[PDB]
Symmetry: C4
Subunit: 264 residues, 4 copies
């Protein structure tokens, strides 16, 4: 089967949580505090009852934790709860900001890779697209081959080759980017064929990072391919157009399109 | 026409929003929450009326959302609204900080580029100026040529050459910086002339990034030039002066000035 | 004795504190403010008494600092204290966030290093493990030798060699990573033996940094080894397994295991 | 005179402010808001008077801006002021955090540089010291020569040479670091002497950056030297000691000490 899924996640099981709050969906986060919020008040409401030091307990609890202080219920450790309410809000605000600043890239990866000549040399290719109007600055991309290898002797392990790209870094990335690994004699897949790639159970990982100007935050994206997601002889279709207006356009509708010469 | 505008933006149309709040002007941001703020209270004010569980509805709403708690209007889900008011403030504070920390560079770019000899070799040049008193640390600059190219065969595409600079990085950038691409035989515009640059519809993109010490934040700036914004034979005028005091000064009034030898 | 401890700390004494608040345990932090919090109110409570400008002093103090404003105690510099309460919360919230964002890596280091052949060359090795489910992006690792050296003449000093690794950087680090320094003729420990390493009192420092996608934060980890924590001839045991399901697993239970050929 | 001061600041005058709040001393910052804080309330207090829509104006103003809500003064745009108070606090909290996170390095620079042989080659040297107990990670240092130069023809300009160091980067920096520029034939000051350095009015800039583990923040430091602050033949004294305990110590008391052979 597959070590990597398309989204670049691994299926390796591991035998051996602020992050969970950070990761969980927006709806669930509110719920999770809302709960913590009610509960903490139940704590104090029962802490008062245990007595009657308050004129005229759950609702009084929140009135003093939120610092509403209506007044109809004058106290007496309210002071304690006022501390807790303020740290609660401070803690709350931190998580909010961390969640807001979690990296997030709208980078589209091509559904396939191709191997075809480029500048007269066979080249492994794939392409990326920036899905947002704002540019990504100082972008960098890696293409990694992961593949089963063994010594002349029986030992079996998975190799990790970081492949050489004609352009791994780019100061700016705004539209589309075809990433290219020329398969010369230094290439790990030099001389390789469709059949020999399957045998090595070999796979490809794409990793992307850059900085948005779109937000004061960094971004990451990754994607993975199996060897049967490579189109030999294929070529990515141009996604750039000239409109009737005479103006240049990017058509992402053609982004996954690949041309192939069909033999008889 | 032009793919790039002076400010380094593209005119490519794309066929295929926390950022909007982050981007929008300061005046509009306040308005946008102020609205959200009033509205959310209208929600609760109508949520109470639907009944009369409050002694002595919009104004009571805010009194419990802001946690003012005057008291003349004692309750009963106020508790719910107290949660919302606190997250509202937390959300509010996040956006504020993100906006405050959005990258912003006061970098001035020269209105033109020049090509003239430098150390006995023709050199593409342009210059940058730091507009603030605080230095930018670990600055880096790129000069990119974008240009139409085609195969011997008919296919037409735009090239992107990241040009070699005598100095792409600088640990500090405080005043003025003339960026230089020597046009040797490795240069994409080697042997090139005024006429041949127009034909390729070729353009130049400048990209700048660095870290301020001025704020704990990074900065970006970019600018673009057409081939008719290059002055062949031109030289940037020295912007450094010695004052009457005998003290050294930077005169940004001369920043866009270029000297030219005029032929008969 | 040892300059470095396993955890990569030094024992060098130095003859010559927001950070303390930032560093201190979670329990102690709350205590430290709680104190500051009570005390600041004692200040104002005594500032009122010094007179009786309040209808119907410590408890009134907090009611106006937390902005509870019950009302049974109407005032008059309350205004002053309302400023202080708000900055207190602002200061509080900053420390909280800084603490939350302090770098933290769950990177496991192997208890030993080994020197054994790899691709037919003797190689210094050690391994790292990512202890969390989330990957570390753009990871980098250094292996440094620290060692006593002297001139032909008597002067004695400690050298710091940053060793060459077959792979110092990795775009992603998710599971396990064996770091390798081939001991060729350019190596500081080329020709070196067990005995000659002890004489130089030589030590090894591992330094790790990378960015989590797990949180919008960076991470650091380091570890140190003495020369008697190197196993000559040793080999790290494969920590990867195939489960009954036929699925691939990582067994960290084998992470510190090293195989050795035992001579007669 | 001098272009650079010891602290690495320039004396170049420039002919052509959130940062000010960010920069200003701690005492002045509080004052600056305290003012803004009082004033904004004067605005509303006069906005009420202009009438009498409040039962039983400056003090009522703060009671509704701080959300104290005592109650003895029930309202009516209080709602407006409750918005302002909350953004005020949000703005306040942002500045606080930005100030807290402003880069700050406790890096000590040696009062002088030296030129003396090292590994049998004349070497420009200076040293740095980490003044805090926490290490700086991924540190980098530059040595720049700035110097007047002119063409064979009369034109006069200041050069900026980024000098080659035996070690410009270090994964960790914890104690002391002697930075070294070997003066080989590629060096801008190769063949140079004391007298020829003065004539070029030449100067040296040190720039330091790294990341603390001490706080989740980066650091910068810089320093400058004139040519008469170079000691020819000088050697930095070892700052490392062995204590009576037999334990290794760092004595910063010797940090600026330089040994010199005195000729007859
Ligand atoms: C393709 N590229 C990123 C390498 C260069 C051009 O940038 P872009 O304008 O196509 O986004
Ligand atoms: C021009 N430079 C940035 C490359 C070097 C000098 O820095 P600056 O002092 O002119 O700002
Ligand atoms: C070992 N490595 C980090 C260099 C490459 C592979 O990454 P990983 O998937 O094993 O964590
Ligand atoms: C000197 N150095 C930073 C290059 C290497 C050693 O680090 P340190 O332990 O002396 O601080
Ligand atoms: Cl993932
Ligand atoms: Cl732009
Ligand atoms: Cl440590
Ligand atoms: Cl300075
Ligand atoms: K309140
Ligand atoms: K509040
Ligand atoms: K209140
Ligand atoms: K109140
Ligand atoms: K009240
Ligand atoms: K806050
Ligand atoms: K914050
Ligand atoms: K923050
Ligand atoms: K940050
Ligand atoms: K950062
Ligand atoms: Sm969980
Ligand atoms: Sm760059
Ligand atoms: Sm086949
Ligand atoms: Sm990167
Ligand atoms: Sm929009
Ligand atoms: Sm550098
Ligand atoms: Sm012409
Ligand atoms: Sm950069
Ligand atoms: Sm302490
Ligand atoms: Sm990379
Ligand atoms: Sm031995
Ligand atoms: Sm790093
Ligand atoms: Sm000012
Ligand atoms: Sm490194
Ligand atoms: Sm002399
Ligand atoms: Sm740096």
């Amino acid at each position: 089967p597959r070590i990597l899924n398309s989204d670049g996640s691994s299926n390796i099981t591991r035998l051996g949580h602020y992050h969970d709050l950070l990761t969980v969906s927006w709806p669930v986060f509110i719920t999770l505090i809302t709960g913590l919020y009610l509960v903490t008040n139940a704590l104090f409401a029962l802490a008062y009852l245990a007595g009657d030091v308050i004129e005229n307990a759950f609702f009084f609890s929140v009135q003093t934790m939120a610092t509403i202080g209506y007044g109809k219920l004058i106290p007496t450790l309210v002071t304690l709860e006022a501390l807790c309410g303020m740290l609660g809000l401070a803690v709350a605000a931190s998580l909010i900001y961390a969640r807001f600043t979690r990296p997030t890239a709208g980078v589209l990866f091509s559904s396939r890779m191709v191997i075809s000549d480029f500048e007269g040399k066979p080249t492994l290719m794939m392409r990326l697209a920036n899905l947002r109007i704002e540019a990504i600055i100082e972008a960098d991309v890696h293409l990694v081959l992961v593949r089963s290898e063994i010594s002349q002797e029986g030992m079996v392990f998975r190799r990790f080759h970081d492949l050489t790209l004609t352009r791994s870094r780019s100061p700016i990335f705004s539209l589309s980017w075809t990433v290219m690994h020329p398969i010369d004699h230094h290439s790990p897949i030099y001389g390789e064929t469709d059949e020999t790639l399957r045998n090595s159970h070999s796979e490809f990982l794409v990793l992307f990072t850059g900085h948005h100007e779109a937000f004061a935050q960094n971004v990451h994206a990754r994607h993975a391919y199996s060897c049967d997601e490579i189109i030999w002889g294929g070529h990515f279709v141009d996604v750039f157009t000239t409109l009737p207006d005479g103006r240049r356009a990017l058509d992402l509708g053609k982004f996954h399109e690949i041309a192939q010469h069909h033999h008889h």
